[PDB]
């Protein structure tokens, strides 16, 4: 009924430390309090017992080592590594391989995380509102360019479209058929996505038939589109993804933002 | 078993009959705990649509799927703390929010079916007949009461008919839809509502997906409607040997109304809502929900505003209390239709015994 | 007489007009202020020396504004007042220029069988004191109120909203050894703001706030020792048109449980014009104030009606300046004061 | 923010109601018996103007008596009514231009474009407008919306686009597209050059159109200096936003209230339902603003004048209106219908979501099912119609005739069909 799914990789985005043999990408000690402890704390809050970290390539004991020593655990983790890992897809290729021991709903958060949000209230709004994806937008730094773009509602609260900025044409783009039903669309500017996803019962027939998704992005949350055509079988309650804002200085980790952390965590 | 007491809002010098609140917001949860029933908690808490009927229904499904999940331990026995299990979930209801009789009676079914079978037979064909005879149950004591309901309407409802109701009762939702599509008939449909509920704006929202013209009403002003209308069924919850109805509103208001102007008001039932237990006035066990539910603007229900009001502490004394379960008279119900078909409420226990 | 001379001889005419069509102007006190200042107008600049055509144009004028606005009736009414107080005054002046009596003030078998002076300035003098009863009404019904309330008693209120009940209330729970408890209905459609301004100034004062939905009366009604209301106007076999939501039913659950009703009311707020049917006298209200959106209204219909009639089967006394006066009996006061021909003008 | 003048826009989209104009125009048209025009001159004076400017065209003289019938052309108001003359169907630039070459205003003005039934109060807007011109000097124009009638769904024709901001409240884009009549395009541009400087964008299609501006003196010179504008939504403010000027501001504000500019026949009918109902509040037909009008508000959603004779034996349904002088005979099954001032009637009428303008004279027996009848169009006997059917000037229907669906009716004593002179759809007779 209740299980989790922690996802790790490796430091490929990150610049100037994570490129040395025996350190990985799941414990990071950046600002005194590390990096995995936050998110073990988060799955402790959630009441969720059953839950499975999935492990890359690199590094196949050492996640083993973190999760017993040191730490308060008290929970049965297990760490697998599956084999179809290549990269050049960070996770989509995992959850692939791993969808007979979904017995419930699953919840997906990754190791890298910098969270302060009251973290009851997004699980609840996932059980309440009758919906199937439910996902997460942070306000910008605000401590004294090109970026990223996103859609909104405000009454419900709901979620569209997704896309970003470095793979598109120059002008910016609306579908006809993705307005007439649904009307108001909100667009924003300084929301930054924190990557934290939920999942219902009815999702593994997608993933063993036909995949499509990169970067657990791409076929997700946009294949919600039943107008126009109808052409890819729906499972059914329609196929809808939702969305819900917050004020706390708490985010995504991807650039230059590890040493901004750092200088947060002091306070 | 969780969290209990320290919580806002005073104890309130006038009504105090039952107290007033409980879990909400879910933390430290007990390991054994079928997330249906607390599913069910987490709606009624807020909820819209059901009143009455459909809720013990709920109750009984959960129940059935809380049945088909149960198998028989190596150590403990079929009837070893199935029983405390149903009783701390009884108590775990109560502390959400009072039940009603229907459910009481169900309770007791099950009870009675826990006595019913020895602990000796095959586990597997125990359940299997178990959930059958259950299913039976709810057919009999649910479906077919309803359709009983309905078929005693189509004789007693006149050729074109205007009908004017308060609630949610499905049966009466199904009742004039029945009238509607089915058999149908020419039906001037009004419904009344309150402030903090939306129950008779859904039954108009829904009788018009299934296409009838509507009529929708508030407190303020009932008579205006009035002086023309003909026929009227009102909220039925729970009936008790005295002969009122606990019911939902102010019903009892439009009741006085009927009353002294013309016509008789009268209410279909199911043979299984009666009681045994018995009150006389709207002070006797009251049933309560959070002031919080008319702070807010009307309009809708989710709006979050900025104005004037949010004051139960903040200023000088400002108690802003309500009820959700009322009196309903004697002398005005004079229909009763059952499972037994026919009766008065006068003859408030005539089927209690006959059962 | 129609609109021709009166727009350029009186200046804001055409303001009060639109104040009265389009309710610029709020208050049924503010409008009778504005309906003697019109008056004051007409008298200081405008010159007659003729005083039955003036009269008679007065009548019209009056007409004409009841026309205009078939539910605000204290504009009439102070029309109605002041041409009485012409009227009597003529008539002692005739007696004079020309050169018996009855078994009470007024005579009835006199309708049926044939029966320069400084009166301009008796004539202002009038307007004055018909200012000066409007402002200080109160303080002649404050001894006459605190006559009637006891200790232990609870009190409900629906429908409060003007500053005379309020401050009848204040005057009230000053002597606060008196003990009264408040019930408060909030009044759905327009009366809630108001409700809670009320509310508000309770809390003030430091009155026992309990905060009602209309739908919960019966529930009370047992418990409820003393009902207060506070009318917008008054009528001729006892009813009232109270301002707005929720009196009714109120009245109708006081009937069936028998239980006392006050109002507080002034005779200038009482209208001689007997109200004969729902059918016209009760005003409805706007759906704007009750759901959102409008697609959903082209099957269902919605029904609301702002200010609400009273049958005077219910209500038993009128705590004025005068005195608390007996519903079946009110007629007669309006009468000491109104007529039989100033009815249908 | 005393002594104010305007500018109004009647006279401006005939055609679009195609079946009538041929004799009366446009804007003189009744809604439920009181004509359009009048709402807009009451939120004038409501606003507080001194100086009036009107356009007349098409079907001119008869605009022109009317107004001077109306209680204005007399003196006790604070304002007057002036006339300006223009050529037989025109855009809204030319007259902008002929405005500028008279030349008159000093300081803030107003121009309402198209047929406006707004309840808002606008004191507190015009103080807001004062308030952010006092901001910053290179700032023009005003511009309202509302939140729309439930879903866009109904609403077919008018699929406005509006893009805005929440700090300082301004728009850039506009944008139209058909949709489930012919399903075609599926593509939108939006502008790229500055958008970190304003950072909060709010983007909302489901907006109610009304087309009004509180404008300052910028706007003719504006018009002056730039002659290629022909329109004020579709190009012109747009025009200004992108780098015409540099610096230039405009305002964007919003009200839940009810305000609808008509524009179509089924936008119209569904004006006249919500009048009907209790929507509108600072219009009402109990409150009589007319002085001539003595309607009032009853029981079961009906309107009525006084004066009023009927038959007996009776049926009625909701939200429907009964004007003064209408002689009925036995009969009327009246659902959701307006019927002007005087109507002989010999006998029954089967309503359901009807329309009937001023003085009709209805013979005997008619079935009619969503349809109009426009002023002095006589019915014979045996009118039976379809849904959204409309009928123009002085169409004497006589004797036997049937019609469904979209059927549009002539009213020149020259495009359309079904005609004015003797049987309309059962021989060709007239011009």
């Given at each position: ?6 996802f ?17 990408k ?14 073990l ?23 083993e ?52 949000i ?12 009758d ?17 990223q ?28 058929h ?14 930054l ?8 019962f ?17 076929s ?6 039943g ?19 917050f ?18 965590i002091?306070? | ?13 006038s009504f ?10 879910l ?8 997330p ?12 819209k ?18 049945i ?14 199935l029983?405390?299990?149903?009783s ?12 009603s009789?229907?459910?009481?009676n169900?309770?007791?079914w ?12 095959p586990?597997?064909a125990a359940?299997?007949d ?8 709810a057919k009999e ?9 309905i ?5 007693q409802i ?5 009908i004017v ?7 009466l939702?199904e ?7 089915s058999?149908?008939?020419?039906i ?6 309150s ?14 997906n299934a ?6 009403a508030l407190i303020t002003?009932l008579?205006?409607?009035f ?9 039925a ?9 606990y ?17 008789p008001?009268?209410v ?5 809502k ?38 139960l ?11 959700k ?6 002398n005005?119900?004079?229909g ?20 | ?11 804001t ?29 007409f008298?200081s600049?405008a010159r007659?020396?003729?005083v ?16 205009a606005?078939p ?22 002046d ?5 050169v ?10 006199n309708?049926?069988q ?13 307007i ?13 019904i ?9 200790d ?19 005057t009230?729970?000053?002597?606060s ?15 809630t ?8 100034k ?15 009366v ?6 409820v ?5 506070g ?7 006892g009813?009232?048109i109270?301002?707005?939501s ?12 028998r ?9 200038y707020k009482?209208?001689p ?17 009750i759901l ?5 209204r082209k ?14 089967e ?7 300046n ?9 007629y ?10 100033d009815?249908?003008? | 923010?005393?002594?104010l ?21 446009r ?14 001159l ?28 109306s209680?204005?052309?007399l003196?006790?108001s604070?304002?007057?009514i002036?006339?300006i003359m223009?050529?037989?169907?025109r ?6 231009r002929?405005?500028?070459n008279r030349?008159?205003?000093?300081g803030?003005?107003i ?7 707004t309840?808002?109060?606008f ?16 700032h ?7 939140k ?14 509006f893009?805005l ?22 593509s ?17 299609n489901?907006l109610i ?13 504006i018009?002056q ?7 004020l ?6 025009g ?33 339902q919500?009048?009907l109902?209790?929507?509108c ?8 603003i ?18 009023v004779?009927?038959?007996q ?5 909701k ?7 209408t002689?009925?005979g036995?009969?009327t ?14 006998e029954?009428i089967?309503?359901?979501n ?5 003085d ?7 079935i ?15 009118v ?26 002539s009213?020149?004593?020259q ?5 004015t ?11």
């Amino acid at each position: 009924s209740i299980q989790a799914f922690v996802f790790c990789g490796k430091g490929s985005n990150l610049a100037p430390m994570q490129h040395s043999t025996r350190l990985p990408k799941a414990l990071l000690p950046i600002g005194n309090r590390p990096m995995i402890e936050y998110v073990l704390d988060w799955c402790d809050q959630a009441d969720f017992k059953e839950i499975s970290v999935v492990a890359p390539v690199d590094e196949i004991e050492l996640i083993e080592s973190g999760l017993t020593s040191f730490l308060n655990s008290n929970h049965s983790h297990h760490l697998q590594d599956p084999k179809k890992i290549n990269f050049i897809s960070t996770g989509e290729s995992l959850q692939k391989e791993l969808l007979p021991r979904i017995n419930g709903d699953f919840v997906i958060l990754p190791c890298d995380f910098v969270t302060d949000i009251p973290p009851q209230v997004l699980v609840d709004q996932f059980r309440n509102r009758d919906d199937n994806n439910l996902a997460m937008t942070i306000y910008y730094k605000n401590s004294l360019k090109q970026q990223q773009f996103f859609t909104v509602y405000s009454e419900i609260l709901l979620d569209v479209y997704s896309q970003r900025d470095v793979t598109k044409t120059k002008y910016l783009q609306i579908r006809s058929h993705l307005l007439w039903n649904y009307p108001n669309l909100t667009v924003s500017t300084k929301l930054l996505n924190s990557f934290i996803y939920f999942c219902s019962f009815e999702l593994c027939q997608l993933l063993k038939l036909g995949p499509q998704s990169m970067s657990r992005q791409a076929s997700f949350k946009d294949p919600f589109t039943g107008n126009q055509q109808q052409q890819n079988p729906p499972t059914t309650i329609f196929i809808l993804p939702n969305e819900t804002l917050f004020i706390r200085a708490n985010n995504l980790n991807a650039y230059m933002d590890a040493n901004r952390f750092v200088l947060k965590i002091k306070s | 078993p969780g969290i209990s007491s320290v919580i806002p809002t005073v104890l309130e010098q006038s009504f105090d009959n039952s107290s007033l609140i409980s879990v909400k917001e879910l933390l430290l949860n007990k390991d054994l705990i079928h997330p249906s029933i607390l599913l069910l908690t987490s709606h009624l808490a807020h909820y819209k649509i059901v009143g009455s009927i459909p809720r013990c229904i709920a109750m009984l499904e959960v129940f059935q799927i809380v049945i088909k999940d149960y198998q028989t331990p190596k150590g403990t026995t079929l009837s070893r703390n199935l029983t405390s299990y149903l009783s701390h979930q009884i108590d775990l209801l109560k502390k959400a929010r009072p039940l009603s009789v229907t459910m009481g009676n169900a309770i007791r079914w099950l009870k009675q079916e826990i006595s019913l079978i020895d602990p000796s037979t095959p586990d597997k064909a125990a359940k299997k007949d178990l959930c059958e005879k259950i299913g039976q149950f709810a057919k009999e004591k649910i479906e077919l009461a309803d359709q009983l309901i309905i078929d005693n309407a189509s004789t007693q409802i006149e050729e074109s008919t205007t009908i004017v109701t308060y609630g949610s009762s499905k049966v009466l939702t199904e009742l004039l839809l029945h009238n509607a599509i089915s058999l149908k008939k020419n039906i001037k449909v009004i419904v009344v509502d309150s402030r903090p509920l939306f129950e008779g704006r859904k039954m108009a929202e829904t009788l018009r997906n299934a296409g009838v013209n509507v009529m929708y009403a508030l407190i303020t002003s009932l008579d205006t409607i009035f002086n023309d209308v003909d026929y009227v069924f009102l909220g039925a919850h729970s009936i008790l040997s005295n002969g009122f109805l606990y019911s939902r509103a102010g019903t009892a208001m439009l009741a006085m109304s009927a009353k002294r102007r013309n016509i008789p008001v009268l209410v279909c039932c199911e043979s299984l809502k009666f009681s045994q237990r018995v009150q006389l006035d709207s002070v006797t066990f009251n049933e309560l929900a959070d002031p919080n539910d008319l702070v807010n603007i009307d309009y809708e229900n989710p709006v979050e505003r900025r104005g004037n009001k949010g004051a139960l502490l903040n200023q000088f004394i400002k108690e802003r209390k309500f009820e959700k379960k009322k009196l309903a008279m004697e002398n005005k119900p004079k229909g009763n239709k059952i499972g037994g078909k026919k009766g008065s409420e006068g003859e408030s226990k005539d089927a209690s015994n006959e059962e | 007489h129609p609109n021709a001379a009166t727009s350029d001889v009186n200046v804001t005419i055409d303001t009060f007009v639109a104040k009265l069509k389009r309710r610029q102007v709020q208050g049924s006190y503010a409008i009778a202020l504005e309906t003697l200042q019109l008056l004051m107008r007409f008298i200081s600049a405008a010159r007659w020396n003729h005083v039955n055509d003036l009269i008679e144009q007065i009548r019209d004028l009056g007409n004409s504004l009841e026309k205009a606005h078939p539910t605000a009736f204290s504009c009439g009414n102070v029309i109605r007042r002041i041409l009485a107080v012409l009227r009597d005054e003529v008539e002692e002046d005739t007696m004079s220029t020309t050169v018996v009596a009855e078994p009470l003030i007024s005579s009835m078998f006199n309708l049926l069988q044939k029966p320069k002076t400084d009166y301009r300035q008796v004539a202002i003098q009038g307007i004055k004191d018909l200012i000066d009863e409007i402002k200080n009404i109160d303080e002649g019904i404050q001894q006459i109120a605190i006559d009637l309330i006891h200790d232990h008693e609870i009190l409900l209120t629906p429908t409060p909203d003007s500053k005379t009940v309020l401050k009848f209330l204040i005057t009230a729970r000053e002597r606060s050894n008196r003990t009264f408890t408040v019930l408060v209905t909030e009044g759905f459609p327009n009366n809630t703001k108001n409700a809670h301004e009320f509310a508000k100034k309770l809390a003030q004062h430091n009155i026992e706030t309990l905060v009602v939905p209309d739908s919960a009366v019966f529930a009370l009604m047992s418990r409820v020792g003393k009902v207060i209301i506070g009318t917008k106007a008054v009528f001729v076999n006892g009813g009232t048109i109270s301002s707005n939501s929720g009196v009714s039913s109120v009245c109708e659950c006081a009937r069936e449980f028998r239980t006392p009703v006050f109002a507080v009311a002034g005779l200038y707020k009482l209208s001689p014009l007997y109200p004969f049917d729902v059918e016209k006298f009760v005003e409805f209200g706007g759906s704007q104030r009750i759901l959102p959106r409008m697609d959903p209204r082209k099957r269902l219909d919605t029904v609301n009606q702002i200010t609400d009639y009273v049958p005077p089967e219910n209500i038993d006394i009128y705590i004025t300046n005068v005195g608390g006066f007996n519903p079946s009996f009110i007629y007669r006061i309006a009468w000491d004061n109104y007529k039989q021909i100033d009815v249908h003008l | 923010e005393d002594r104010l003048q305007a500018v109004v826009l009647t006279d401006s989209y005939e055609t679009r109601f195609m079946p009538l104009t041929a004799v009366k125009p446009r804007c003189l048209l009744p809604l439920a018996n009181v004509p359009l025009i009048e709402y807009t001159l009451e939120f004038l004076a409501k606003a507080g103007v001194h100086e009036v400017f009107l356009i007349c065209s098409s079907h001119a003289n008869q605009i022109n008596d009317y107004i001077e019938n109306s209680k204005w052309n007399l003196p006790w108001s604070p304002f007057k009514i002036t006339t300006i003359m223009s050529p037989e169907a025109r855009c809204t630039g030319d007259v902008m231009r002929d405005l500028d070459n008279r030349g008159i205003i000093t300081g803030d003005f107003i121009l309402v474009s198209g047929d406006v039934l707004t309840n808002i109060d606008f004191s507190k807007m015009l103080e807001f407008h004062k308030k952010m011109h006092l901001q910053d000097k290179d700032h023009i124009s005003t511009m309202c919306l509302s939140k729309a009638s439930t879903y866009p769904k109904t609403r077919t024709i008018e699929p406005a686009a509006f893009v805005l901001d929440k700090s300082t409240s301004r728009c850039i884009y506009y944008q139209d597209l058909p949709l489930p009549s012919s399903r075609e395009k599926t593509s939108i541009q939006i502008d790229p050059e500055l958008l970190d400087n304003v950072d909060e964008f709010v983007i909302r299609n489901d907006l109610i159109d009304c087309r009004i501006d509180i404008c300052t003196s910028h706007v003719p010179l504006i018009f002056q200096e730039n002659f290629d504008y022909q329109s004020l939504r579709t190009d012109f403010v747009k025009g200004v936003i992108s780098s015409d000027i540099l610096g230039k501001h405009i305002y964007a504000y919003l009200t839940d209230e009810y305000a609808v500019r008509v524009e179509s026949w089924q936008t119209y009918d569904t004006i006249s339902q919500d009048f009907l109902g209790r929507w509108c509040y600072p219009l009402v037909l109990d409150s009589n603003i007319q002085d001539d009008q003595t309607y009032s508000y009853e029981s079961r959603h009906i309107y009525k004048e006084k004066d009023v004779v009927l038959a007996q034996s009776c049926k009625i349904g909701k939200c429907t209106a009964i004007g003064s002088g209408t002689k009925i005979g036995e009969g009327t099954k009246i659902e959701n219908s307006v019927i002007g001032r005087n109507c002989q009637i010999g006998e029954n009428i089967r309503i359901k979501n009807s329309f009937i303008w001023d003085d009709c004279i209805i013979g005997n027996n008619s079935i009619i099912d969503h349809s109009l009848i426009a002023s002095n169009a006589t019915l014979g006997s045996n009118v039976r119609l379809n849904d959204g059917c409309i009928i123009g000037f002085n169409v004497k229907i006589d004797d036997n005739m049937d019609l469904d669906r979209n059927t549009k009716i002539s009213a020149s004593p020259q495009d359309l069909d079904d005609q004015t002179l003797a049987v309309s759809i059962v021989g060709d007779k007239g011009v």
